[PDB]
Symmetry: C2
Subunit: 574 residues, 2 copies
């Protein structure tokens, strides 16, 4: 009829294999024949478009240029039929929805997907179904292994602030969506708001498996997550990662240096790049702050999330794979990253970078290394003297979390200043001398330590930091290991008191230039709360224990010629 | 609940030039009611502003039509662009065209925020009977008073330079085919937005090579006219508001740049029409309720769904004629700081207010936070005076308050980093035993003198916590040549004593047991306001090396009783 015009239809119903119906809205352009189509799957109400779109694209431009778009409510929420349970229904429900679209008289045979966070995980669940008409995807800030992110981790400890925050949010949604109110609704709303104003206080109640409010409204919180600490049968059935090597579907991938999903986002790129056309973009953002401005650190206006440039890139990508235009991606790079320290964008040909040198930095020093005014050092040469550092860990007084990859508890300040915790006795410090030449670090990061303990189970932690001329000490990346899971996440065994073990710690990834006049620094301890839950030091079932039945431990770090403890850094020199 | 969308339909004005609009229309039997929005930032880009307003697609699903328009000389519209001057006439011609169409039932209204709120008052004065109601958020009806100058008569320099840079960047990106100099200009614009205070430091201030080329209005209208003269009068609307009788839904924020003038519009229209008011604790770019050294709670976050429900009921009463649509809705609703809770009221100002003077005093000099200045409800018994030296080359820096572009996301800031300077005087009460509530408009009355023929004076109110934090509340300024009038200024003489008044806008706070009440007095606040030269010449045309220093004084006692006036509530 007329180029650039369109129309909208509400509440169209779509049948699943068991008889349940799900509701959708349709945005269709004026046209003289069938067109290409794009799909989104959402658990936060399909009507409320303004709440998520500012974190994605200006997608009405796609419709004005001739694409149709479909938005859906997931099973058991808002306008859809059925009952709601996280993750377990999403693979089959996507298969049945894609089949329905291909049956309509307005579809030309070509389909794709886009979206962020939970709207990103649903895209990988669709890709393994085996439907021929799906041509390309674009998942932002997401994961394909739900144990590794966001509920547990590669070290085998529970992410307690993430679980309690998300659950209270879904609960508040169910109360507000009802027409006819229940008698208990008014009091429940008051208690839910008290959790969100103080997440750390709510995580402090023992035993942890006792949740009168949250357990009543959503049984899944206890029946699946808290009751299953090993990476066993229940978790492996909802994992997609092992099947990714057999596919051949193109994917446009996005991430952030201070985002909770960052480790697992990068792993998906490495797994698909050999078999199809993949692309990557990485900025300095956290999950709830995309501005580029923080309390003690500013990156500049070029670091603010660039919504118009992202809209242009997505459209070129679909024109190639859905419309078959062979020259649509001309002059577009393979990898694009924001390099901190110098604070500017830069283009590359692969990830990991092709000219990388993995280099050990050794722990040493005369005298004890306790606090920031002790005597710990870092060097590229092996230490000459044999020594050991010692401290006491008490579960009733843990080290508090400050910045990093937090989601709901104070999650708007990623590059935080560390000075408020520097003078604790259970925090060991090691650093280099003041630098005269610049040093670049870009890639994956980890550590190898020699340790011992007075109990049959405990935890160990490590963290990388940048020290400014004016005194500021800014955080970069971190990780943890729980001792019973030192060799395997599937079949755990306890340790022997007083014996020495060699262990590895996964610290995710970063990109930063350390300038002349700065120092490189490392922090080592046994806790980080409420980012991770606290170890009891007994060897029993942690989530079922009272505070008064836990105990303290004496822990040690060994260093020298026969025990060479170190951190491994990815150096770039051009 | 179904609808359709038509884009780029062209509408002719009285001189022949045409403006572009988009149409959002529902599936219906016959004619429907209509709503209009006028925007200078591209009508296609709806996601950029909507999160600060309403979920307006709910109106369309319920049977309303919506129209959005590009202003003269920008994006898809014809003609030439210059701020403010064409908006009164273009709105009159647009309203007439809508009423002529077959799909309109004869009832029309408006909504929007900031510049999209200023255009609503410009439409109201035209006298078109078909316009039934309006809803302006974070706005003003006297453009000298906010946001370009103020009630004290100093220039708001960070606001002008910030906004001009933003518009200029838009004109370059909107082009079809580029010019050779475009890339070099783009670099210079970014450097201004990364350091606003550096760009304001250049002398003479009137010399702007880049900004004066891209938009001549910056120099020709704003900088060259510091008196409130004939050129300003022709774009002011305030005096015409009293006799209109049009219903209005008005929103504002305690740390927003427009706050003083938003509240004055409510007082002007409340006697002969159905007016309403809502006030939260926000600044122009931060609506979250979270700040660096102060948190207000999750109930303080801008409540978008409750705001959508209130707007819909307001239009149902005045455009559809439903008598009882606003049953149980209050007239006034405010967020009270300190106790941190929402509360309903019957009027603004509040019916039971008591205006109470707090006097300046103390033994010894009052310089610095470790000096001897006091505040009390009793008059001081001894005659004294405090003294300090003000140098234009080293002024007091702005921290929090009502800033717009230079560090504008930390309204309630900790004051500890600046209050040990030799040119800042401090006065406070003892530790309190019982709570005290202050809610309303605020001002001060002082006796002053100087060794120069012209200068400035400033004042600011503060809350002191038991742990040490010193949190800012509200502030103001006065430029001595304008002490009696903004229209016809005169100079002073060295040595003589004058009695003057300072306008400190408004607030709402409860001081709890264990806290103190405090005031700061000085002669500068930069770059929130520009710097006085102390010569009596044409300030904006002078070089830095041509300016000079001054010796200023504050007098206090039984003969000269300086004080601050606080609005006390006791129930």
């Amino acid at each position: 009829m007329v180029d650039g015009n369109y129309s909208v239809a509400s509440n169209v119903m779509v049948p699943m294999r068991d008889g349940v119906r799900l509701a959708v809205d349709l945005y269709r352009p004026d046209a003289d024949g069938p067109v290409p189509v794009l799909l989104v799957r959402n658990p936060y109400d399909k009507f409320d478009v303004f709440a998520w779109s500012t974190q994605s694209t200006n997608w009405l431009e796609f419709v004005r240029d001739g694409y149709a778009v479909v938005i859906q409510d997931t099973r058991g929420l808002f306008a859809s039929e059925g009952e709601f349970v996280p993750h377990v229904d999403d693979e089959a429900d996507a298969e049945d929805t894609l089949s329905w679209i291909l049956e309509q008289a307005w579809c030309d045979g070509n389909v794709g997907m886009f979206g962020v966070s939970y709207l990103g995980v649903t895209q990988w669940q669709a890709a393994v179904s085996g439907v021929g008409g799906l041509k390309a995807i674009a998942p932002s800030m997401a994961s394909a292994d739900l144990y590794r992110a966001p509920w547990y981790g590669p070290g085998g400890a529970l992410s307690v602030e993430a679980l309690l925050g998300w659950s209270a949010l879904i609960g508040t949604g169910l109360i507000t969506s009802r027409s006819d109110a229940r008698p208990e609704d008014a009091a429940d709303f008051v208690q839910l708001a008290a959790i969100l104003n103080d997440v750390a206080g709510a995580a402090s109640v023992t035993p942890l498996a006792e949740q009168p409010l949250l357990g009543r409204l959503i049984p899944w919180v206890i029946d699946q997550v808290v009751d299953h600490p090993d990476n066993d049968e229940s978790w492996q059935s909802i994992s997609l990662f092992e099947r990714l090597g057999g596919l051949a579907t193109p994917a446009l991938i996005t991430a952030g240096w201070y985002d909770g999903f960052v480790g697992e986002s990068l792993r998906t790129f490495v797994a698909v790049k050999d078999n199809a056309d993949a692309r990557l973009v990485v900025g300095p953002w956290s999950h709830s702050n995309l501005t580029g401005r923080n309390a003690d650190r500013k990156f500049g206006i070029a670091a603010t999330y660039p919504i118009q440039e992202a809209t242009t890139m997505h459209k070129a990508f679909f024109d190639r794979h859905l419309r078959g235009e062979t020259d649509a991606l001309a002059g577009v790079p393979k990898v694009r990253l924001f390099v901190m320290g110098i604070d500017e964008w830069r283009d590359e040909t692969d990830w990991p970078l092709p000219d990388t040198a993995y280099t050990p930095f050794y722990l040493g020093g005369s005298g004890a290394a306790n606090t920031s005014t002790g005597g710990g050092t870092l060097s590229t040469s092996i230490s000459g003297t044999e020594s050991a550092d010692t401290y006491l860990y008490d579960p009733a007084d843990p080290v508090p979390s400050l910045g990093g990859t937090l989601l709901f508890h104070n999650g708007d300040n990623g590059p935080a200043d560390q000075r408020p915790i520097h003078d604790r006795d259970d925090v060991l410090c090691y650093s280099t001398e003041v630098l005269t030449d610049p040093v670049e670090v870009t890639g994956t990061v980890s550590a190898r330590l020699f340790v011992s303990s007075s109990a049959v189970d405990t935890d160990f932690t490590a963290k990388l930091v940048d020290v400014f001329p004016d005194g500021r000490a800014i955080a970069l990346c971190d990780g943890i290991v729980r001792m019973r899971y030192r060799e395997t996440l599937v079949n755990p065994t306890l340790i022997e008191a007083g014996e020495i073990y060699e262990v590895a710690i996964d610290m995710l990834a970063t990109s930063n230039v350390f300038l002349p006049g700065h120092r490189i620094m490392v922090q080592v301890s046994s806790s980080n709360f409420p980012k991770y839950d606290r170890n009891s030091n007994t060897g029993g079932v942690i989530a079922r224990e009272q505070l008064e039945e836990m105990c303290t431990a004496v822990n040690r770090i060994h260093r020298g010629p026969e025990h060479p403890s170190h951190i491994v850094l990815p150096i770039i020199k051009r």
